[PDB]
């Protein structure tokens, strides 16, 4: 048996990555016929371009195309790999400028940055997914397309009965790729327990695979005298760098649980705030790095005519629901009591079992007091975004705004809002 794949967001950075990854697992994930998908033409085009040249080389058998149909790309498939950015790195630019000229953080998914971020993935996501489900209603939908934990909380409402729709995340896998080069381990003989939402947990334990023993005590130690090193410190921009590394003050303050590396900007944001610059920021080191490296590459392998841990995770995913492997990985569930103290219709990121029948969550039980408050006042802000969404209404994006942590004043949510309408004037939905 073979697979169909279509790539959703063909002209995206990280496709080259997905092409070789493709190439590399061919003999774990065997596939007949490739998609890549997108609404820009002339940026997917030499993407694409360099994917023939790869597969000829390397992949002859498979059957590869791109295209800016939906029926080309979504007809007959088995599995849609999710990738856009609504509004592109453009409007990620705004999302971090107009925040960070305001007073506040300016981040690609979370505070005022993010949550513009996701209102116009709301209205890209859920019109994409209603494309797909015209032309192949039981493939298997992986998303990794941003912000997740808002868009997950959107799908939630859109699709309520649709049971072939994953959202995952990268960022706890490469925590535990951090830890296994910390603990000279491989990264795959770690198995942690951890709860929270996406961009927003705590791993309360770290057990080796074999012996079973916490591991969690040892880690903390050799952070205090050596630091946090992300796994491929090497090729990581210096921006990365102090986001990894910072992880070593979050322990010696709040030193229970291992923290995602996003929970620093909800515990400490007046000091992110600080060190971030307001006229040069993350889009633009994107921007003239890995987009422009990568955009590169693709030219010179078309000039010439002849010719990883991201892709390969989706990857991953795809084969453990493929063949009913029942394997564990970190991704997005509805809680429905996996967490007891939240509400049931939370969208929360914990540790599942991931076969044929998608996730299947292990309860965590009670939450800590800190962390109930830390998340109850998050996954509201979020749900009173997806609220203005549906309901078009202005008091409820206000509300959203102000309940967040990186905003946490009325009368600045209104006025970072309000800007944020006239940027977005074509992106978002109406705000009345
Ligand atoms: N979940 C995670 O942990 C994780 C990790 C890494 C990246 N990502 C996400 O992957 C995405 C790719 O990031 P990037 O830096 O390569 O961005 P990018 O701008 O390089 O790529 C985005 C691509 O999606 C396309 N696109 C935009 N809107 C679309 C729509 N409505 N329909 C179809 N295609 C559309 C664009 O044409 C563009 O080619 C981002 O959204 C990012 O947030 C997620
Ligand atoms: O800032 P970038 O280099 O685009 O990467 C940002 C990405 O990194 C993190 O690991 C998160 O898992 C992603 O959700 C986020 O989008
Ligand atoms: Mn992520």
Redesign the pocket.
Known sequence: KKYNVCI??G????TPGFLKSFVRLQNEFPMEKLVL????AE??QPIGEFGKILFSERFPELDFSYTTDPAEAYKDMDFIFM????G??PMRREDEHISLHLGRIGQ?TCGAGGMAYGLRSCV?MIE?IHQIRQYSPNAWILN???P?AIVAEALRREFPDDNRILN????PENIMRSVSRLLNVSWEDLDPVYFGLNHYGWFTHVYDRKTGEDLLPEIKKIIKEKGFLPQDAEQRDQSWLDTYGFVQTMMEDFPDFLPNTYDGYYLYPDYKFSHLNPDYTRADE?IDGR?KRVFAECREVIARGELDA?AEMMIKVAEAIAYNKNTRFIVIVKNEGAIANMQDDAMVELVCELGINGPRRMAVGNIPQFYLGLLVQQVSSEKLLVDAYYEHSYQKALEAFTLNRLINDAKKAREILDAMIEVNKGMWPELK
């Open positions: 959703v967001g002209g995206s950075t990280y998908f997108d609404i820009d940026r997917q990738q856009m950015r609504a592109g790195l690609e890209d994409s990794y397309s941003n997740a995952i995340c990268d960022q994107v987009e991201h």
